[PDB]
From a paper:
In the nucleotide pool, which is more susceptible to oxidation by reactive oxygen species than DNA, human MutT homolog 1 (hMTH1, human [name]) is the most prominent mammalian enzyme among other enzymes responsible for sanitization of the nucleotide pool. hMTH1 is characterized by broad substrate specificity as compared with Escherichia coli MutT; that is, hMTH1 hydrolyzes different oxidized nucleotides such as 8-oxo-dGTP, 2-oxo-[name], and 8-oxo-[name] with almost the same efficiency, whereas MutT shows high substrate specificity for 8-oxoguanine nucleotides. Accordingly, hMTH1 prevents mutations and cell dysfunction by its hydrolytic activity toward both 2-oxo-[name] and 8-oxo-dGTP. Here, we carried out structural and kinetic analyses of hMTH1 and demonstrated that hMTH1 shows broad substrate specificity for 8-oxo-dGTP and 2-oxo-[name] because of the exchange of the protonation state at Asp-119 and Asp-120 depending on the substrate.
To validate the correlations between the structure and kinetics in the Asp-120 mutants, crystal structures of the Asp-120 mutants (D120N and [name]) in complex with 8-oxo-dGTP or 2-oxo-[name] were determined, respectively. On the other hand, in the structure of [name] complexed with 2-oxo-[name], there is no electron density of 2-oxo-[name], but there are electron densities of water molecules in the substrate-binding site. Our kinetic analysis showed that [name] has 6-fold higher Km compared with the wild type, and crystals of the [name]·2-oxo-[name] complex were prepared using a higher concentration of 2-oxo-[name] (see “Materials and Methods”). The substitution of Asp-120 with Ala decreases the affinity for 2-oxo-[name] 6-fold, but the D120N mutant retains the 2-oxo-dATPase activity similar to that of the wild type, with comparable Km and kcat, indicating that Asp-120 is protonated during the recognition of 2-oxo-[name]. The loss of the direct interaction between 2-oxoA and Asp-120 explains the lower affinity of [name] for 2-oxo-[name].
Numbering used by the authors: 1 to 156
């Protein structure tokens, strides 16, 4: 069995639009995603998610709601990514570009799936329907899913 590392992912989902961030530099640049990163020692997962949202988007929020969990496995990487997915309760400031991520609003009939992680085509529709989910995705590289599971759950 494999060890897992904790990550967060935050979707700022409003009634007609969603905020995504384009990764600007390094490997993986060019893909839109929610905001997030590794959880740090001592902080709750929710507090790590709030911290990453502020660092990557500039938005400071008091509370998030957990909507899902996705485990990622990559061929050749023994460590799994255990990603805890949150949506914002409300926001009260403007997003800002950080040298590493460019935030952008998308209308909910223009979700940029072709420029997102392939897994998001599966779980983001559940997120839009205000459902909770558990997913697992095994990737060859960045683009190819070899195996995956997705289930709606009542409790994350
Ligand atoms: Na990040």
């Amino acid at each position: 069995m494999k060890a897992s590392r904790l990550y967060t992912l935050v979707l700022v989902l409003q009634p007609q639009r969603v905020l995504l961030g384009m990764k600007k530099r390094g490997f993986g640049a060019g893909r839109w995603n929610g905001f997030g990163g590794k959880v740090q020692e001592g902080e709750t997962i929710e507090d790590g998610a709030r911290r990453e949202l502020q660092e990557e988007s500039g938005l400071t929020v008091d509370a998030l709601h957990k909507v899902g969990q996705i485990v990622f496995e990559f061929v050749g990487e023994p460590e799994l990514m255990d990603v805890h997915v949150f949506c914002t309760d409300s926001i009260q400031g403007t997003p800002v570009e950080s040298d590493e991520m460019r935030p952008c609003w998308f209308q909910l009939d223009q979700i940029p799936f072709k420029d997102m992680w392939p897994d998001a085509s599966y779980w983001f529709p559940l997120l839009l329907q205000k459902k909770k989910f558990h997913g697992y995705f095994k990737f060859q590289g960045q683009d190819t899913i070899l195996d995956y599971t997705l289930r709606e759950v009542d409790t994350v």
